[PDB]
Every structure is written in C-alpha cells, then in structure tokens.
Design a protein around this ligand. Sequence first.
Ligand SMILES: Nc1ncnc2c1ncn2[C@@H]1O[C@H](COP(=O)(O)O)[C@@H](O)[C@H]1O
Length: 420
Amino acid sequence: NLYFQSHMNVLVIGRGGREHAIAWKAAQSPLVGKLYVAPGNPGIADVAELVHIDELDIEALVQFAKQQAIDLTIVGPEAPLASGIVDRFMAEGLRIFGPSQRAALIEGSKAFAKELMKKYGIPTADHAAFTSYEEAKAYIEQKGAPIVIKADGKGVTVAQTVEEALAAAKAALVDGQFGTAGSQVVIEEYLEGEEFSFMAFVNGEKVYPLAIAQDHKRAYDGDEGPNTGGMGAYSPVPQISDEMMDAALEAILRPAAKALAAEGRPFLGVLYAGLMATANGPKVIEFNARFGDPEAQVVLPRLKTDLVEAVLAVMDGKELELEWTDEAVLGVVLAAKGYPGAYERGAEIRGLDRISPDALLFHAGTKREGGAWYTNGGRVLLLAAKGETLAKAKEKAYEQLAAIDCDGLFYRRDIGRRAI
Ligand SMILES: Nc1ncnc2c1ncn2[C@@H]1O[C@H](COP(=O)(O)O)[C@@H](O)[C@H]1O
C-alpha cells in the first residue's frame, strides 16, 4: 500500500546467520537493485555481494556507503551500534536502520536497563550490586530465596536457601575479581516460567511488534551445559498465551520505547526483549538492541510483508501492520564441538548440496576453499524448515539435518520438543 523508491542500493553489516537471513529477505524485495554485505561470509555470497570491511571499521564503512551511494544500511551485530556506527552515518547523511550509541546502551549496560525499568515501572527481575557484604546480606535477607548470586572473575549460583545465598555472596566478595572499585557481587531475583523472545521494530515511541519466538540458549539437550548465543529456535510459540503477549507489548515494549525517548535516547531499529512468562505476568530478563540470532532466522521467513518496505515505513514513522504466514518455522544450530567453549576449526562439511531447496540454510561460520566447505566459527550453520504446524516444521528440519556430515559439528536434537 505504501510507496518507496526502487532500485535501491542496500548494505547489511555483519557476518553471521542473522545477516544471511536479513540479506536473503532483502534480496527478494522489488525495491532493491544492489545488495552488499560487509563482511558477510561464503554462504551469504549466494544472495549478495561481499564487501571486505570489518563491522567495526566504521570510517571505512562510511566511505564505502557514500562511494556506492547506499540508500539504506541495516546493522546486524550490536558491536558496531555500541561503537556509534549510527551516529557517524547520520552525520554523513546516510540512512541507516539501527539505534544511536546512546539508545543502544539498553543492551550494552544491564545496569542501565535495570535503572531505566525501575524508574519507569517496567516489570523485570529485581537487581542489585554490592561491594559490601553487610549491605549484600541485608538485601538478601529481604528478598529471600531462591535467589541468584553472581560473582565476577562458574560464578553464577541459584541459591535455594538464604543461608546458601549468604555463603555464596560472601565468597563472591572474598574470592571475586578485585576491580578498580574493589570486588563486587550481583544479586538478582530468580524467575520461573516460560522464556520467549519478543522483537519489534521501533522508532521513538512507535512500536511495530514482530512474531514472538522461543530460543534454547543451553548448549545441550535437556537444557544442560553452559549458556550460548542460541542453539535453536522456533516461531510461533503456542505455550505463550495471547494475553501474555499483549501484556508484554503494552507493559514492556511500548513503555521501554517511551522511556528511552523520554530520557533523550530515542531508539530506532529492532528492540529485542528477552522475556519470562511468569504467573505474575511477563518480566524482562534482558534487552537487546538488534535482531536476535537465531531468532532472525526463524522469524524473518514468516514475515510476508516486504522487509525493506517495512524498515523504510518504520524509519518514516508511517503506519504499518506486518503480515505473517500461518506456517511455523523451526531452526537448529550446528555448532563446532566445544562451543561455547574452546572449539576447533577446519573440519570438512559434506552434504550441503543434499539439502532440499525448500530448506532454509543460513551460514554463520563457514569457509569455502578448494571447492569444499569447512567449519570456521563457534556457530557454523542453522537449518530451518517451514511447516503447517510446529511438529511438522520440527520433523522436516531434523530430517534435512541428517543429510549433513561433519565430525567437527554437533546440534541439539530436542529443539521444539516441549513445545510439541
Ligand atoms: N533473573 C533470572 N532468572 C531466571 N533466569 C535467568 C535470570 N537471569 C538470567 N537468566 C538465564 O540466563 C540466560 C542468559 O542470560 P545471561 O546469563 O545474563 O546472559 C537467560 O536465557 C536465562 O535463562
């Protein structure tokens, strides 16, 4: 219904699966003439031209963007946002979809986020930091247990009793790292319920919600092992009621966007809320200032609305209702053995040519050499599949995953298990 100039030159900043998903979606826009990804990866080269410039080499990206007359730049990773890529681009008159350094702090500093949510009455887990044991003790005795104790320098304890919490807190301050302000201990309210990711396009106070998704951050099946950037995800999320979703939109997302704007930090881009559906309603775990990975890989394929058109509409503050397919999407991450810890690179990946054309294969950390594929990163690939139902999406995804053979990769087999 909306009109925007065609034959656009578009630049996507990043190198992972999230960027491959963004590029893939952008390439299908009738408004795009030329698509570039910096620095991208071998898999992304199949849908866009790679630009050999680091995401943090801001001065070069600015020059490149002006040189190639880029009409729109989309930032994937948070690093360049935290570095002020948006600020520099805007000063050069370059259109870019992403938050300013000041607004991106919502993700950069968990303390800032907690500070903001407390001031504006946004539901979230209680949070407090201490350098004094006596002060930590008094606080712990007020909140009770179970409670979370976090030491700096492994260091996270979910204390089941107040006594254990005190022992852990004392240990954190005694054995924790000695910073320039001494040792410190972080205490947080332990929340229970179903976790879900709620992303939305934002521009000032205007919020445009995206479909919600559920990511499994634990490294191993049965949600065991250390936390990761995400080992799998799916959308929609049946177990999250529409009421929980709406409460999240009206009591969390809209208020956060208004809070940032009220604080002189208007946000533009994708505001990603990591939430917990508790019995008392939705509560924020953390905020991210851009597309989540692997959330983007399973949510963007469900978006029927043209992505580029949507982004431009948001940037112009125009009205827009996003449309989504009824079909579900589930994705599974293939990671290098050892990840999220130390992992090896260089294992050959066979079978990428055996996967169905309907399967969505997003490259993270792959490398092409001598006509073959090799692992080259923590998270290497993500394979997603569409399905009439979540169960169908899950079956198709895992069915296709078996076609891949690599002794240097592993992947959870329980993605979507509980949901179904
Ligand atoms: N206050 C909390 N209550 C329950 N779980 C939490 C809390 N904070 C963090 N987590 C878990 O830790 C994971 C990663 O958050 P983080 O360790 O801060 O990077 C989340 O996906 C949650 O499952």
